[PDB]
Design a protein around this ligand. Structure first.
Ligand SMILES: [Fe+2]
Lengths: 82, 82, 82
């Protein structure tokens, strides 16, 4: 997956491989993600680090130009569930 | 596709998924692209935002270390056509 | 392949396509890499530019959260050998 700081896949970005227990700990991505591309698999997003406080919406492959539309504000962590 | 600020796939880079109607709206990519990698599909590049004023050259998968050679100095938008 | 400035796939990153005879030539990759993801192919890493002074370790697809564990500090160049 790829996270983007701004909507419509703009701004600084961050590559996710299988999972990230602490998205906010990356110094090169000092931003809350505002859009997302899922390349393969189905993913669960979490408000907090270490896979706590999951969002209800799960994300299969696709382009998500404004994840705030899905209720997503902060992504503390995320992982492939299938 | 991937755009790069410098020739030969160096400098800040920008990932394009399917299309970008406004490359220049990306503040994190404050540069004219000078090289490009196409990973899949064939792409059309445009001088202006919103898929207007296309360049004639179309780009299939490959590594393009100096897109100025193709007469491309600014990319206002781009999209996968196949 | 993807090079990361920080361990555990964090920090500024750099995409490698088939090979790079001079990794250090990239002004935007302002650091010695500490982790790497190989997406496809098997890669040889070198201490010097232009594929001189190879490391003995060869890297197939996978996630390598600390390449120092493999005795790798500087990557002057790298290329696929398959
Ligand atoms: Fe990237």
């Amino acid at each position: 997956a790829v996270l983007f700081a701004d909507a419509n896949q703009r701004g600084v970005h961050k590559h996710i491989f299988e999972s990230d227990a602490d998205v906010g700990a990356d110094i090169a991505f000092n931003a809350t993600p505002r859009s997302m591309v899922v390349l393969s698999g189905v993913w669960r997003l979490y408000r907090e680090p270490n896979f706590q406080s999951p969002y209800e919406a799960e994300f299969g492959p696709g382009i998500y130009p404004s994840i705030a539309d899905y209720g997503i504000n902060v992504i503390g962590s995320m992982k492939r569930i299938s």
